[PDB]
Design a protein around this ligand. Structure first.
Ligand SMILES: [Zn+2]
Ligand SMILES: [Zn+2]
Length: 77
């Protein structure tokens, strides 16, 4: 037969704003600005997951980590 990791079998992806804070709930056009904002809440890693609730220094660290958590936009009738 046939097989192999494929995933990404989604039709519509609706992920939160590209640059938005979870602490307060604000959004920004630039990531650089948002990064400086999060500070007003805490001065730690510029990245932090929500599902698990962990902080990361590098980007890739989170980019790949996200995997652990299912990624699929919400569907509706
Ligand atoms: Zn905030
Ligand atoms: Zn996580």
């Amino acid at each position: 037969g046939s097989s192999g990791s494929s995933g990404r079998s989604e039709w519509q992806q609706r992920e939160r704003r590209r640059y938005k804070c979870d602490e307060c709930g604000k959004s920004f056009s630039h990531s650089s600005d948002l990064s400086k904002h999060r500070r007003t809440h805490t001065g730690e890693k510029p990245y932090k997951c929500d599902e698990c609730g962990k902080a990361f220094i590098q980007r890739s660290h989170l980019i790949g980590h996200h995997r652990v958590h299912t990624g699929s936009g919400p569907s509706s009738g």
